């Protein structure tokens, strides 16, 4: 009753010839829902979804002074045009500019990064690999339910960082807002798995979500949000 | 070249046999634009846009502890259905719930309300009339350009309240968010005059805006955003 399985959601993966898990948390009702209880606990590389805790650490250690501080383009031309320009934290999260956050990581350092993830209870708290790439190709792993447990602490300012830090990152996670709802979320792609994790704010409740799916090619990345919104629409969380 | 008149925007008021003013401020270029220099500097009752400074003062004085504190419906049935329910700061601003804010004002009190509005350099800084209604039927007045100045201070956290108070109110002002822009803004109506004030966040710039227009009946209230958005589209600030 605290966790329920709804296999009817699998049709949202089936219709797109894909496979994955959607995990929802109803905060008011303290209830979880997923299409696959097993895969909901499978831990994967966080990839770009690691920008949430990475932002928190860089803000709270003073590696990032605020959301307007500019991090200049390094002049290296990269495959994603939006990366080859100056960014602040907000645009850095919106375009998921990895090189910005790799520099963040180097400045944090191994010891403090590892110490902070333990304080966050984040995933398997393993940073083996390059200090500036372990969340792309090192030891760190996190499941969808783990993502939800981390996002809920952030929502309630219960992470061991300043309230200011936590508010700035939730500001930067802002994806969508209209008269019906607000989504604060972050996507990720590790070359094999696609992530979308965040929450949907409503007038009188909040719905946490975390999804991942098999992503053999970059062409289907749009599906991360499509399949999630189909689920939220089936559950009358969004119109 | 600080302020410039663009009378073409009058076509957007003319198109709806209406009259009023749009004022824009290009933050990067420190340059302002309006269709009506005279009306840009004319002072009106702020009405519900006063929820912005009221929220700031309520938070900073501790009348409001955070954005989730609930203010229960007093049971008085009022003409706007969304008012007859419990609200927190986010929903009270979203639904422009005056009784919530009149209670704020009553708890703030005349002496502190006056001192804070003076600290904010807000309008004519005159709170003559009922402490819980002076912004609707009292002696307080503010111009569109004065609105811009106030909002620019809030954006830059330069008001004489805490950084946290300013951040919470900008969160409460969140009106729209998509991949192209964010609008944080507040509407208002005093039964003769309609207001829309706020700003449009872009990747690399912010456009402040304050508009008002003659509002003989409530039926044209959506023109506040419609006419503003026509201007922003014309200036290519939004698609
Ligand atoms: C993080 O997951 N990133 C950065 C960027 N984010 O795109 S998103 O999936 O829309 O958030 C692109 C994908 C990924 C990478 O850094 N890419 O390197 C390996 C994954 N393709
Ligand atoms: C403030 O301007 N208000 C409160 C409420 N907000 O609607 S909005 O204009 O869409 O922000 C209704 C309109 C207005 C009134 O209070 N209306 O009566 C005027 C005297 N209170
Ligand atoms: Cl990253
Ligand atoms: Cl926000
Ligand atoms: Cl009000």
Closest CA–CA distance from residue B167 to any residue of chain A (Å): 8
From the list A186, A184, A193, A182, the residue with the least C-alpha distance to A238 is: A182
B167/B67 Cα distance (integer angstroms): 11
**Residue A165: beta bridge partners?**
none
Answer yes or no: A48 catalytic: yes
Q: Which residues of A are annotated as a binding site for Mg(2+)?
A: 84
Give the alpha-carbon dihedral of A53, A55, A59, A62, to 10 degrees. Answer: 100
User: Can you give the resolution of this entry in Å?
Assistant: 2.2
- C-beta pairs of A156-161 under 8 Å, 24+ apart in sequence: A159/A56, A159/A119, A159/A120, A160/A119, A160/A120, A161/A56, A161/A57, A161/A59, A161/A60, A161/A116
Q: Got the DSSP string for chain B?
A: --EEE-GGGHHHHHTTT--EEEEEEETTTTEEEES-HHHHT-EE--GGGGHHHHHHHHHHHTSS-STT--B---S---SSGGGSS-B-HHHHHHTT-HHHHHHHHHHH-HHHHHHHHHHTT-TT----S-TTTHHHHSS--EEHHHHHHHHHHHHTT-SSS-HHHHHHHHHHTEEEE-SS-EEEEEEEE-SSEEEEEEEEE-SS-EEEEEEEEE-SSGGGTTHHHHHHHHHHHHTTS--
B107-111 — which CB contacts under 8 Å span 24+ positions? B107/B58, B107/B63, B108/B54, B108/B57, B108/B58, B108/B61, B108/B63
Class of the domain covering B3-209+220-234: alpha beta
What is the Rg, in whole angstroms, of the alpha carbon atoms belonging to chain B?
17
**Rounded-to-integer distance, Cα A149 and Cα A166, Å:** 15
B221/B110 Cα distance (integer angstroms): 31
Which residue in this structure is represented by tokens 């009358």? Answer: A236
* Tokens 């929450």 -> residue: A199
Q: Please, are residues B190 and B47 in contact by the beta-carbon 8 Å criterion?
A: yes
Token representation of residue B40: 């840009």
Q: Which residues contact B201 (CB under 8 A, 6 or more apart)?
A: B181, B182, B183, B184
Q: How far is CA B185 from the centre of its chain?
A: 6
- Cα angle vertex A125, ends A123, A126, to 5°? 120
Nearest residue to B185 via CA among B80, B45, B37, B48: B48
- Which secondary-structure segment (H or E) carries A144? helix A144-155
Residues 6 or more apart whose CB falls under 8 angstroms from that of A19 comprise A13, A213, A214
Whose CA is closest to A178, among B180, B232, B175?
Answer: B175
Do B176 and A177 count as a contact with CB atoms less than 8 A apart? Answer: yes
- CA nearest to B139, candidates B46, B19, B15, B9: B46
- Note whether B171 contacts A176, CB cutoff 8 Å: no
Which residues on chain A are in Cβ contact (under 8 Å) with B182? 174, 177
Could you please state the CATH topology (level 3) that the domain comprising A3-234 is classified under: Beta-lactamase (3.40.710)
Question: What would the two tokens of residue A88 be?
Answer: 């602040």
Give the integer Cα–Cα distance in Å for B132 and B143. 21
Provide the greatest CA pair distance for chain B.
54
Q: Per the annotation, does B15 bind a ligand?
A: yes
CA B79 to chain centre: 22
Q: Would you say the CB of residue A212 lies under 6 angstroms from ligand 1?
A: no
Residue B109 alpha carbon to ligand 5 centre in Å: 15
**Phi-psi label, residue B75: left if phi above 0, alpha if psi -120 to 50, beta otherwise:** left
**Annotated domain spans of chain B:** 3-209+220-234
Taking the CA of residue B137 as reference, the ligand 2 atom at the shortest distance is: 20
Method: X-ray
> Among candidates B178, B174, B180, B195, which has minimal Cα distance to B236?
B180
CA distance A195 to B21: 45
How far lies B197's CA from each of A61, B22, B42, in Å?
36, 9, 15
Pair of tokens at residue A13? 């993966």
Q: Determine how many CB atoms are found less than 10 A away from the CB of residue B58.
A: 25
Q: Is A63 helix (H, G, I), strand (E, B) or coil?
A: coil
CB contact under 8 A, B182 and A178: no
Residues from B in contact with A at Cβ < 8 Å? 91, 94, 163-164, 167, 171, 174-179, 182, 203-204
CA B3 to centroid of ligand 4, rounded, Å: 30
Cα gap A63→A72, rounded to integer Å: 14
Closest by alpha carbon to B115, among B186, B60, B187? B60
In terms of Cα–Cα distance, which of A221, B7, A234 is closest to B22? Answer: B7
What count of CB pairs under 8 Å joins A to B?
A: 32
């Amino acid at each position: 009753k605290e966790w329920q399985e709804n296999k009817s959601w699998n049709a949202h993966f089936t219709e797109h010839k894909s496979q994955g898990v959607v995990v929802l948390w109803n905060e008011n009702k303290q209830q979880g829902f997923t299409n696959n209880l097993k895969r909901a606990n499978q831990a994967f590389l966080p990839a770009s979804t690691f920008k949430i805790p990475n932002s928190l650490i860089a803000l709270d250690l003073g590696v990032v002074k605020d959301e307007h501080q500019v991090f200049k383009w390094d002049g290296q031309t990269r495959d994603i045009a939006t990366w080859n320009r100056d960014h602040n934290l907000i645009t850095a999260m919106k375009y998921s500019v990895v090189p910005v956050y790799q520099e963040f990581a180097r400045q944090i350092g191994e010891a403090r990064m590892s110490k902070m993830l333990h304080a966050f209870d984040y995933g398997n708290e393993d940073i083996s690999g390059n200090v500036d790439s372990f969340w792309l190709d090192g030891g760190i792993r996190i499941s969808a339910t783990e993502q939800i447990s981390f996002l809920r602490k952030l929502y309630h300012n219960k992470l061991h960082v300043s309230e200011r830090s936590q508010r700035i990152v939730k500001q930067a996670m802002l994806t969508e807002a209209n008269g019906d709802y607000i989504i604060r979320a972050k996507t990720g792609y590790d070359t094999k798995i696609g992530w979308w994790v965040g929450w949907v704010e409503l007038d009188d409740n909040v719905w946490f979500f975390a999804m991942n799916m098999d992503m053999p090619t970059s062409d289907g990345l749009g599906l991360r949000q499509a399949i999630t919104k189909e689920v939220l629409k089936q559950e009358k969380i969004i119109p």
